[model samples]
Target: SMEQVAMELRLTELTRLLRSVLDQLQDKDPARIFAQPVSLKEVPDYLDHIKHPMDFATMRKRLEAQGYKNLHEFEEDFDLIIDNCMKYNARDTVFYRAAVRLRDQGGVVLRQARREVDSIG
Candidate 1:
């Protein structure tokens, strides 16, 4: 619950900043806003998968790799992602659902571990 509250507060701030950016871009035609090359879901997916420590640069790279090419739009998104990761587990239920979707597409899970050796050896 604490994590959720923290994340929500960060998201609120991010939303406010993005509103300003969008307002600045208002002169651009809105009719084709949805026609961007990247799928609408990819950016959000990248955000939701972020890990803690606010690795903004790496997250930016991953988003671009996923075809989120709108360079100007990423500042708010990246900030929101780092903010949430700092406050909450990004790999929670939402990530599990995303994994399940990928699993249905034939993805498989893997695990690894190391065994201890004799102390005297």
Candidate 2:
């Protein structure tokens, strides 16, 4: 029988799965709004409402840097991007509607991805 090593696997596979989810988001977002961070100069009131803003670009940087230690961290940042949009944009706007759909769809994908990551650990 094979034995598990004391050393960790460095989350390479987990990173791949997470990247897929990010790509899914990027592809579905028609305006490419999620592709980058929200500019405060363009929308001064963004931070006043949403305290913790996140973006696909920021998450990618952390993923490449291997900054995520667990599935929870990755999930947090993923959810935060959608949440920040829902919080900042008014219900009448497309941004809010897009966020709602992304949350409902992307949320499940990430949830299953987390379960897979968990079973590995």
Candidate 3:
């Protein structure tokens, strides 16, 4: 199918762009982009392990505010960001901002979970 081919192409491009971002943001831990998926039960510990100590309770509220009630919703929003990346080149301002947002919002972890799910199915 043409649509499948297009999506596959987009996915390839996205992977290329993501690797560039990962290289550019090398803070001595490039493999952080491949971190293990965080389960809801481990959110607190994960947040603690990071540089920033996020408030899980407040984050929960914010997630709900952003209409992300579950991991599925977050994954869908992440996919939208990937779509934007394919539309706008990696060097584009919009794509860069979206990528930054994803980084800040645990996009890598979500994407890792997505990879696991994709491999299983």
Q: Which candidate leads in TM-score?
A: 2
RMSD of each: 19.3, 3.4, 15.0
Pick out the ten consecutive residues of candidate 2 with the lowest summed lDDT: 1-10
TM-score of 1: 0.25
Clash pairs for candidate 1: none
Ranked by TM-score from best down, the candidates are 2, 3, 1
As a TM-score, model 3 comes out at 0.27
User: What lDDT tens digits, residue by residue, belong to model 1 across residues 1-121?
Assistant: 9998876655555444434433333223233321232232645554354433323344434443443333334444434432443344345655334323332331111010001111211
Find the 10 residues in a row with the least total lDDT in model 3: 51-60
* Candidate 3 residue-wise lDDT, 89-119, digit = tens: 4555754554565456555555665565456
Provide the clashing-pair count of each candidate structure: 0, 0, 0
Q: Model 2: per-residue lDDT, tens digit, 1-121?
A: 1233323354666677777867876666777778888999998887788888899899999988767877789878978988888777789999889888877777677777777777876
lDDT of each: 0.36, 0.78, 0.44
In candidate 3, stretches whose alpha carbon ends up further than 4 angstroms from where it belongs are 1-66, 90-108, 111-121
Candidate 2 residue runs with Cα over 4 Å from true position:
1-8
Give candidate 2's error at residue 84 in angstroms: 1.3
